[PDB]
């Protein structure tokens, strides 16, 4: 009976959850179902054997509204909201320019980045962009990111530093990621007084 005394659980019995809890649960449910969704997977499941080229059909023009008019037939063939198509394609075409040849990047890594980041603000204006969907589809590309790119993001305001650093699942991952990239960038910025200016800007920011 001391056996019972040790074994017995008290929290066991429960009640019928509150309605706000109901929508919280359903919210987190859909959140997780989308967290585990993936888009090249769907392009190859639904469509036969993602980048702005995959959307806009072979480099026709870098115009603004043309991309937008395509994304609609994209999300219509799929069933997704357009904002997530946009977030994923842009996370991908961000990993592209960070990767394809330190804590910094410069010329043409900047130019294509800004040719596309400008277009991001156009789609924000038309509301055809999801913003946490983009924070999370960047954290899928976690380590292929540049501290200068994310600061360009912070400053052109497609995303805030805080909308990133509260949207990462793991917090220790964030902390250490940032610690190492800081340590590397402060080993930088004494390399030359020109590198120093752009590094000091983002440091004090």
């Amino acid at each position: 009976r001391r056996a019972w005394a040790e074994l017995l659980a008290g929290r066991v019995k429960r009640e019928k959850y509150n309605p706000e809890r109901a929508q919280k649960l359903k919210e987190s449910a859909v959140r997780l179902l989308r967290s585990h969704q993936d888009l090249n997977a769907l392009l190859l499941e639904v469509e036969g054997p993602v980048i702005d080229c995959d959307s806009s059909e072979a480099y026709a023009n870098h115009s603004s509204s043309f991309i937008g008019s395509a994304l609609q037939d994209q999300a219509s063939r799929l069933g997704v909201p357009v904002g997530i198509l946009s977030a994923g394609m842009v996370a991908s075409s961000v990993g592209q320019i960070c990767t394809a040849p330190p804590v910094l990047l410069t010329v043409e890594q900047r130019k294509k980045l800004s040719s596309l980041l400008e277009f991001a603000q156009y789609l924000l204006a038309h509301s055809m962009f999801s913003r946490l969907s983009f924070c999370q589809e960047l954290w899928k590309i976690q380590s292929s990111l540049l501290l200068e790119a994310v600061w360009h993001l912070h400053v052109q305001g497609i995303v805030s530093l805080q909308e990133l650093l509260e949207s990462h699942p793991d917090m220790h991952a964030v902390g250490s990621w940032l610690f190492r990239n800081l340590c590397c960038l402060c080993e930088q910025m004494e390399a030359s007084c020109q590198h120093a200016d752009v590094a000091r800007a983002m440091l004090s920011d």
């Binding site: 109901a22 649960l25 359903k26 449910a29 859909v30 179902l33 989308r34 585990h36 969704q37 993936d38 997977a41 769907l42 499941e45 639904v46 069933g79 997704v80």
Partner: peptide, 20 residues
């Protein structure tokens, strides 16, 4: 074997349903 397509339909039943 459409492990992504199933997620959308389940997400839609989550949205519209109160019995999930």
């Amino acid at each position: 074997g459409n492990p992504q397509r199933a997620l959308l339909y389940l997400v839609a039943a989550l949205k519209e349903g109160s019995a999930w």
